[PDB]
Amino acid sequence: KVNLKYDSWHKEVLSKFGQMLGSNMTEFHSQISKSRQELEQHSVDTASTSDAVTFITYVQSLKRKIKQFEKQVELYRNGQRLLEKQRFQFPPSWLYIDNIEGEWGAFNDIMRRKDSAIQQQVANLQMKIVQEDRAVESRTTDLLADWEKTKPVTGNLRPEEALQALTIYEGKFGRLKDDREKCAKAKEALELTETGLLSGSEERVQVALEELQDLKGVWSELSKIWEQIDQMKEQPWVSVQP
């Protein structure tokens, strides 16, 4: 009875370890195959600086994962050899470690070719990102200088009027923030780690944010007064009571 129970308990633990190892092996092979297909689709000779930045950030993210993937391949290799030594029955749909090693080898060869091409252009990509960042900083200074000219400090504005201009200002400032965040992700991806001090541009963006879409709010309390003025520009004089 004990031997039957041990054989049943062993066969059950061996079957569960085999299903867990096969599931982890299938998921890991899908993850390497997808990472390899994404590496194949992107060319270093991308026409746009934006595609080159996205591709370089992706290759660096994969380079960090290679050391983890290598440990997983070794764990799966030892696991399958244990199932074979214990006469486990492999299902016909079993993904053999040789397929994972082949996809892992193909992924490493594409990753080495793409990483080498990024490393050859690192200085040019770093100069392009520093030039784009200087262009974003110049656009930031120009937008803040224009901010004063077209903000409501100008006299005789109407609730609606400035609100429309402060809706454009809101779009320009938010587009500027999105461009700055893209440059920051690219700088992190190319190891262009320059001091985490908000550039004096960040303090200007924070002041502008307080008076951005919020400045349309001066056309919120005044808007309620104007709606009454407009109704009076439509109300019959006899009906109006002083």
PDB file of all heavy atoms in Angstrom, residues 98-150, unseen atoms left out:
ATOM      1  N   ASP A  98      15.850  22.737 -26.623  1.00  0.00           N
ATOM      2  CA  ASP A  98      16.591  23.052 -27.876  1.00  0.00           C
ATOM      3  C   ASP A  98      15.867  24.160 -28.656  1.00  0.00           C
ATOM      4  O   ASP A  98      16.564  24.983 -29.275  1.00  0.00           O
ATOM      5  N   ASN A  99      14.530  24.152 -28.690  1.00  0.00           N
ATOM      6  CA  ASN A  99      13.768  25.249 -29.354  1.00  0.00           C
ATOM      7  C   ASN A  99      13.966  26.580 -28.616  1.00  0.00           C
ATOM      8  O   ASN A  99      14.130  27.613 -29.296  1.00  0.00           O
ATOM      9  N   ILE A 100      13.926  26.564 -27.280  1.00  0.00           N
ATOM     10  CA  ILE A 100      14.164  27.801 -26.474  1.00  0.00           C
ATOM     11  C   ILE A 100      15.605  28.273 -26.670  1.00  0.00           C
ATOM     12  O   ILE A 100      15.796  29.475 -26.824  1.00  0.00           O
ATOM     13  N   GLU A 101      16.567  27.348 -26.673  1.00  0.00           N
ATOM     14  CA  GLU A 101      17.994  27.704 -26.885  1.00  0.00           C
ATOM     15  C   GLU A 101      18.167  28.275 -28.297  1.00  0.00           C
ATOM     16  O   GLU A 101      18.959  29.219 -28.450  1.00  0.00           O
ATOM     17  N   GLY A 102      17.479  27.702 -29.289  1.00  0.00           N
ATOM     18  CA  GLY A 102      17.544  28.248 -30.660  1.00  0.00           C
ATOM     19  C   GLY A 102      16.958  29.653 -30.758  1.00  0.00           C
ATOM     20  O   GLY A 102      17.651  30.532 -31.299  1.00  0.00           O
ATOM     21  N   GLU A 103      15.768  29.893 -30.191  1.00  0.00           N
ATOM     22  CA  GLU A 103      15.162  31.257 -30.187  1.00  0.00           C
ATOM     23  C   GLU A 103      16.017  32.204 -29.342  1.00  0.00           C
ATOM     24  O   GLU A 103      16.165  33.371 -29.745  1.00  0.00           O
ATOM     25  N   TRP A 104      16.529  31.729 -28.207  1.00  0.00           N
ATOM     26  CA  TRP A 104      17.403  32.549 -27.326  1.00  0.00           C
ATOM     27  C   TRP A 104      18.693  32.900 -28.069  1.00  0.00           C
ATOM     28  O   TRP A 104      19.153  34.046 -27.935  1.00  0.00           O
ATOM     29  N   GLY A 105      19.259  31.943 -28.809  1.00  0.00           N
ATOM     30  CA  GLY A 105      20.450  32.237 -29.631  1.00  0.00           C
ATOM     31  C   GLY A 105      20.131  33.255 -30.720  1.00  0.00           C
ATOM     32  O   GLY A 105      20.850  34.261 -30.799  1.00  0.00           O
ATOM     33  N   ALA A 106      19.013  33.080 -31.432  1.00  0.00           N
ATOM     34  CA  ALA A 106      18.604  34.012 -32.510  1.00  0.00           C
ATOM     35  C   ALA A 106      18.346  35.405 -31.920  1.00  0.00           C
ATOM     36  O   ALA A 106      18.782  36.413 -32.532  1.00  0.00           O
ATOM     37  N   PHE A 107      17.687  35.461 -30.759  1.00  0.00           N
ATOM     38  CA  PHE A 107      17.414  36.752 -30.075  1.00  0.00           C
ATOM     39  C   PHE A 107      18.735  37.419 -29.683  1.00  0.00           C
ATOM     40  O   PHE A 107      18.889  38.602 -29.966  1.00  0.00           O
ATOM     41  N   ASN A 108      19.675  36.658 -29.115  1.00  0.00           N
ATOM     42  CA  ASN A 108      20.993  37.212 -28.708  1.00  0.00           C
ATOM     43  C   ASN A 108      21.780  37.704 -29.926  1.00  0.00           C
ATOM     44  O   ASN A 108      22.501  38.687 -29.781  1.00  0.00           O
ATOM     45  N   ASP A 109      21.723  36.991 -31.053  1.00  0.00           N
ATOM     46  CA  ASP A 109      22.427  37.423 -32.292  1.00  0.00           C
ATOM     47  C   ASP A 109      21.830  38.729 -32.842  1.00  0.00           C
ATOM     48  O   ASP A 109      22.602  39.621 -33.263  1.00  0.00           O
ATOM     49  N   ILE A 110      20.501  38.825 -32.869  1.00  0.00           N
ATOM     50  CA  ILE A 110      19.841  40.087 -33.322  1.00  0.00           C
ATOM     51  C   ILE A 110      20.137  41.197 -32.311  1.00  0.00           C
ATOM     52  O   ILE A 110      20.526  42.296 -32.734  1.00  0.00           O
ATOM     53  N   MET A 111      20.036  40.877 -31.021  1.00  0.00           N
ATOM     54  CA  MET A 111      20.279  41.872 -29.952  1.00  0.00           C
ATOM     55  C   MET A 111      21.736  42.344 -30.040  1.00  0.00           C
ATOM     56  O   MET A 111      21.923  43.546 -29.989  1.00  0.00           O
ATOM     57  N   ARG A 112      22.701  41.445 -30.257  1.00  0.00           N
ATOM     58  CA  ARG A 112      24.121  41.865 -30.396  1.00  0.00           C
ATOM     59  C   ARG A 112      24.304  42.756 -31.631  1.00  0.00           C
ATOM     60  O   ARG A 112      25.002  43.762 -31.500  1.00  0.00           O
ATOM     61  N   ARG A 113      23.682  42.415 -32.762  1.00  0.00           N
ATOM     62  CA  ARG A 113      23.807  43.242 -33.991  1.00  0.00           C
ATOM     63  C   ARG A 113      23.203  44.638 -33.753  1.00  0.00           C
ATOM     64  O   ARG A 113      23.863  45.648 -34.104  1.00  0.00           O
ATOM     65  N   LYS A 114      22.002  44.694 -33.169  1.00  0.00           N
ATOM     66  CA  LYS A 114      21.298  45.985 -32.914  1.00  0.00           C
ATOM     67  C   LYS A 114      22.017  46.792 -31.821  1.00  0.00           C
ATOM     68  O   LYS A 114      22.159  48.010 -31.992  1.00  0.00           O
ATOM     69  N   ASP A 115      22.462  46.134 -30.745  1.00  0.00           N
ATOM     70  CA  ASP A 115      23.199  46.797 -29.635  1.00  0.00           C
ATOM     71  C   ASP A 115      24.523  47.348 -30.180  1.00  0.00           C
ATOM     72  O   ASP A 115      24.861  48.469 -29.802  1.00  0.00           O
ATOM     73  N   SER A 116      25.215  46.593 -31.044  1.00  0.00           N
ATOM     74  CA  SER A 116      26.480  47.075 -31.659  1.00  0.00           C
ATOM     75  C   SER A 116      26.201  48.294 -32.548  1.00  0.00           C
ATOM     76  O   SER A 116      26.976  49.255 -32.477  1.00  0.00           O
ATOM     77  N   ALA A 117      25.127  48.250 -33.336  1.00  0.00           N
ATOM     78  CA  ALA A 117      24.758  49.384 -34.215  1.00  0.00           C
ATOM     79  C   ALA A 117      24.392  50.615 -33.362  1.00  0.00           C
ATOM     80  O   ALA A 117      24.796  51.748 -33.727  1.00  0.00           O
ATOM     81  N   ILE A 118      23.671  50.417 -32.251  1.00  0.00           N
ATOM     82  CA  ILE A 118      23.363  51.547 -31.318  1.00  0.00           C
ATOM     83  C   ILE A 118      24.679  52.057 -30.711  1.00  0.00           C
ATOM     84  O   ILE A 118      24.873  53.272 -30.722  1.00  0.00           O
ATOM     85  N   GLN A 119      25.582  51.164 -30.293  1.00  0.00           N
ATOM     86  CA  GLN A 119      26.878  51.573 -29.676  1.00  0.00           C
ATOM     87  C   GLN A 119      27.730  52.364 -30.676  1.00  0.00           C
ATOM     88  O   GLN A 119      28.397  53.324 -30.233  1.00  0.00           O
ATOM     89  N   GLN A 120      27.734  51.970 -31.953  1.00  0.00           N
ATOM     90  CA  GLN A 120      28.482  52.707 -33.012  1.00  0.00           C
ATOM     91  C   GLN A 120      27.913  54.124 -33.175  1.00  0.00           C
ATOM     92  O   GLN A 120      28.701  55.045 -33.483  1.00  0.00           O
ATOM     93  N   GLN A 121      26.593  54.282 -33.036  1.00  0.00           N
ATOM     94  CA  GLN A 121      25.953  55.613 -33.218  1.00  0.00           C
ATOM     95  C   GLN A 121      25.695  56.299 -31.867  1.00  0.00           C
ATOM     96  O   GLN A 121      25.120  57.385 -31.913  1.00  0.00           O
ATOM     97  N   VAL A 122      26.202  55.785 -30.735  1.00  0.00           N
ATOM     98  CA  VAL A 122      25.835  56.353 -29.392  1.00  0.00           C
ATOM     99  C   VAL A 122      26.171  57.847 -29.353  1.00  0.00           C
ATOM    100  O   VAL A 122      25.282  58.621 -28.986  1.00  0.00           O
ATOM    101  N   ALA A 123      27.363  58.232 -29.812  1.00  0.00           N
ATOM    102  CA  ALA A 123      27.779  59.650 -29.775  1.00  0.00           C
ATOM    103  C   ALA A 123      26.870  60.505 -30.664  1.00  0.00           C
ATOM    104  O   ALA A 123      26.529  61.611 -30.231  1.00  0.00           O
ATOM    105  N   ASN A 124      26.512  60.027 -31.865  1.00  0.00           N
ATOM    106  CA  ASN A 124      25.585  60.777 -32.759  1.00  0.00           C
ATOM    107  C   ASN A 124      24.177  60.856 -32.156  1.00  0.00           C
ATOM    108  O   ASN A 124      23.559  61.930 -32.272  1.00  0.00           O
ATOM    109  N   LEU A 125      23.679  59.762 -31.574  1.00  0.00           N
ATOM    110  CA  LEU A 125      22.336  59.748 -30.925  1.00  0.00           C
ATOM    111  C   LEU A 125      22.340  60.674 -29.704  1.00  0.00           C
ATOM    112  O   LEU A 125      21.363  61.425 -29.523  1.00  0.00           O
ATOM    113  N   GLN A 126      23.425  60.652 -28.925  1.00  0.00           N
ATOM    114  CA  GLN A 126      23.554  61.544 -27.744  1.00  0.00           C
ATOM    115  C   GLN A 126      23.570  63.002 -28.222  1.00  0.00           C
ATOM    116  O   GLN A 126      22.835  63.802 -27.638  1.00  0.00           O
ATOM    117  N   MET A 127      24.316  63.320 -29.286  1.00  0.00           N
ATOM    118  CA  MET A 127      24.295  64.704 -29.833  1.00  0.00           C
ATOM    119  C   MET A 127      22.904  65.065 -30.371  1.00  0.00           C
ATOM    120  O   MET A 127      22.483  66.176 -30.091  1.00  0.00           O
ATOM    121  N   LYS A 128      22.213  64.160 -31.077  1.00  0.00           N
ATOM    122  CA  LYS A 128      20.843  64.458 -31.580  1.00  0.00           C
ATOM    123  C   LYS A 128      19.883  64.717 -30.415  1.00  0.00           C
ATOM    124  O   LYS A 128      19.094  65.658 -30.530  1.00  0.00           O
ATOM    125  N   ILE A 129      19.944  63.911 -29.353  1.00  0.00           N
ATOM    126  CA  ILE A 129      19.068  64.105 -28.157  1.00  0.00           C
ATOM    127  C   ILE A 129      19.420  65.414 -27.432  1.00  0.00           C
ATOM    128  O   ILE A 129      18.492  66.116 -27.017  1.00  0.00           O
ATOM    129  N   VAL A 130      20.709  65.737 -27.300  1.00  0.00           N
ATOM    130  CA  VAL A 130      21.124  67.037 -26.686  1.00  0.00           C
ATOM    131  C   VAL A 130      20.666  68.206 -27.574  1.00  0.00           C
ATOM    132  O   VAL A 130      20.292  69.251 -27.015  1.00  0.00           O
ATOM    133  N   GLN A 131      20.750  68.067 -28.904  1.00  0.00           N
ATOM    134  CA  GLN A 131      20.240  69.129 -29.819  1.00  0.00           C
ATOM    135  C   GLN A 131      18.717  69.262 -29.714  1.00  0.00           C
ATOM    136  O   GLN A 131      18.251  70.403 -29.666  1.00  0.00           O
ATOM    137  N   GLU A 132      17.986  68.142 -29.676  1.00  0.00           N
ATOM    138  CA  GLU A 132      16.503  68.186 -29.529  1.00  0.00           C
ATOM    139  C   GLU A 132      16.157  68.806 -28.173  1.00  0.00           C
ATOM    140  O   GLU A 132      15.272  69.657 -28.132  1.00  0.00           O
ATOM    141  N   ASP A 133      16.888  68.438 -27.122  1.00  0.00           N
ATOM    142  CA  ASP A 133      16.656  69.002 -25.767  1.00  0.00           C
ATOM    143  C   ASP A 133      16.919  70.514 -25.783  1.00  0.00           C
ATOM    144  O   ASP A 133      16.104  71.261 -25.221  1.00  0.00           O
ATOM    145  N   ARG A 134      17.994  70.962 -26.439  1.00  0.00           N
ATOM    146  CA  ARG A 134      18.251  72.421 -26.571  1.00  0.00           C
ATOM    147  C   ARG A 134      17.135  73.070 -27.389  1.00  0.00           C
ATOM    148  O   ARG A 134      16.808  74.213 -27.078  1.00  0.00           O
ATOM    149  N   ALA A 135      16.633  72.410 -28.443  1.00  0.00           N
ATOM    150  CA  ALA A 135      15.494  72.939 -29.234  1.00  0.00           C
ATOM    151  C   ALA A 135      14.228  73.008 -28.370  1.00  0.00           C
ATOM    152  O   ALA A 135      13.513  74.008 -28.499  1.00  0.00           O
ATOM    153  N   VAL A 136      13.964  71.995 -27.534  1.00  0.00           N
ATOM    154  CA  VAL A 136      12.807  72.018 -26.585  1.00  0.00           C
ATOM    155  C   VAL A 136      13.017  73.162 -25.579  1.00  0.00           C
ATOM    156  O   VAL A 136      12.047  73.876 -25.300  1.00  0.00           O
ATOM    157  N   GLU A 137      14.238  73.342 -25.073  1.00  0.00           N
ATOM    158  CA  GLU A 137      14.556  74.433 -24.108  1.00  0.00           C
ATOM    159  C   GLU A 137      14.405  75.812 -24.774  1.00  0.00           C
ATOM    160  O   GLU A 137      13.905  76.746 -24.112  1.00  0.00           O
ATOM    161  N   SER A 138      14.847  75.950 -26.030  1.00  0.00           N
ATOM    162  CA  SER A 138      14.658  77.226 -26.774  1.00  0.00           C
ATOM    163  C   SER A 138      13.158  77.471 -26.959  1.00  0.00           C
ATOM    164  O   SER A 138      12.706  78.558 -26.592  1.00  0.00           O
ATOM    165  N   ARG A 139      12.405  76.447 -27.371  1.00  0.00           N
ATOM    166  CA  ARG A 139      10.931  76.568 -27.547  1.00  0.00           C
ATOM    167  C   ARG A 139      10.291  76.894 -26.194  1.00  0.00           C
ATOM    168  O   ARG A 139       9.303  77.641 -26.199  1.00  0.00           O
ATOM    169  N   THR A 140      10.807  76.325 -25.096  1.00  0.00           N
ATOM    170  CA  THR A 140      10.287  76.629 -23.734  1.00  0.00           C
ATOM    171  C   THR A 140      10.497  78.113 -23.403  1.00  0.00           C
ATOM    172  O   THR A 140       9.541  78.754 -22.932  1.00  0.00           O
ATOM    173  N   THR A 141      11.694  78.643 -23.669  1.00  0.00           N
ATOM    174  CA  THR A 141      12.008  80.070 -23.383  1.00  0.00           C
ATOM    175  C   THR A 141      11.168  80.988 -24.280  1.00  0.00           C
ATOM    176  O   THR A 141      10.664  81.995 -23.770  1.00  0.00           O
ATOM    177  N   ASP A 142      11.023  80.638 -25.562  1.00  0.00           N
ATOM    178  CA  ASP A 142      10.205  81.451 -26.503  1.00  0.00           C
ATOM    179  C   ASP A 142       8.738  81.441 -26.069  1.00  0.00           C
ATOM    180  O   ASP A 142       8.132  82.520 -26.062  1.00  0.00           O
ATOM    181  N   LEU A 143       8.199  80.275 -25.697  1.00  0.00           N
ATOM    182  CA  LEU A 143       6.772  80.167 -25.281  1.00  0.00           C
ATOM    183  C   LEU A 143       6.543  80.971 -23.995  1.00  0.00           C
ATOM    184  O   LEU A 143       5.501  81.625 -23.903  1.00  0.00           O
ATOM    185  N   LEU A 144       7.471  80.904 -23.038  1.00  0.00           N
ATOM    186  CA  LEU A 144       7.354  81.694 -21.782  1.00  0.00           C
ATOM    187  C   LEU A 144       7.468  83.200 -22.074  1.00  0.00           C
ATOM    188  O   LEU A 144       6.766  83.975 -21.407  1.00  0.00           O
ATOM    189  N   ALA A 145       8.346  83.605 -22.995  1.00  0.00           N
ATOM    190  CA  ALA A 145       8.455  85.039 -23.399  1.00  0.00           C
ATOM    191  C   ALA A 145       7.167  85.492 -24.101  1.00  0.00           C
ATOM    192  O   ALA A 145       6.772  86.662 -23.907  1.00  0.00           O
ATOM    193  CB  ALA A 145       9.662  85.252 -24.302  1.00  0.00           C
ATOM    194  N   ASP A 146       6.583  84.625 -24.933  1.00  0.00           N
ATOM    195  CA  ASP A 146       5.305  84.954 -25.621  1.00  0.00           C
ATOM    196  C   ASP A 146       4.208  84.948 -24.560  1.00  0.00           C
ATOM    197  O   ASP A 146       3.290  85.774 -24.653  1.00  0.00           O
ATOM    198  N   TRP A 147       4.302  84.025 -23.599  1.00  0.00           N
ATOM    199  CA  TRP A 147       3.267  83.905 -22.539  1.00  0.00           C
ATOM    200  C   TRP A 147       2.893  85.297 -22.033  1.00  0.00           C
ATOM    201  O   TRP A 147       1.702  85.610 -22.050  1.00  0.00           O
ATOM    202  N   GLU A 148       3.889  86.121 -21.691  1.00  0.00           N
ATOM    203  CA  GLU A 148       3.608  87.464 -21.120  1.00  0.00           C
ATOM    204  C   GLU A 148       2.844  88.334 -22.123  1.00  0.00           C
ATOM    205  O   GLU A 148       1.908  89.032 -21.695  1.00  0.00           O
ATOM    206  N   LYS A 149       3.226  88.299 -23.402  1.00  0.00           N
ATOM    207  CA  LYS A 149       2.589  89.182 -24.416  1.00  0.00           C
ATOM    208  C   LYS A 149       1.105  88.851 -24.612  1.00  0.00           C
ATOM    209  O   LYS A 149       0.310  89.804 -24.696  1.00  0.00           O
ATOM    210  N   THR A 150       0.738  87.566 -24.678  1.00  0.00           N
ATOM    211  CA  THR A 150      -0.672  87.216 -25.014  1.00  0.00           C
ATOM    212  C   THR A 150      -1.474  86.747 -23.790  1.00  0.00           C
ATOM    213  O   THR A 150      -2.602  86.256 -23.990  1.00  0.00           O
TER     214      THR A 150
END
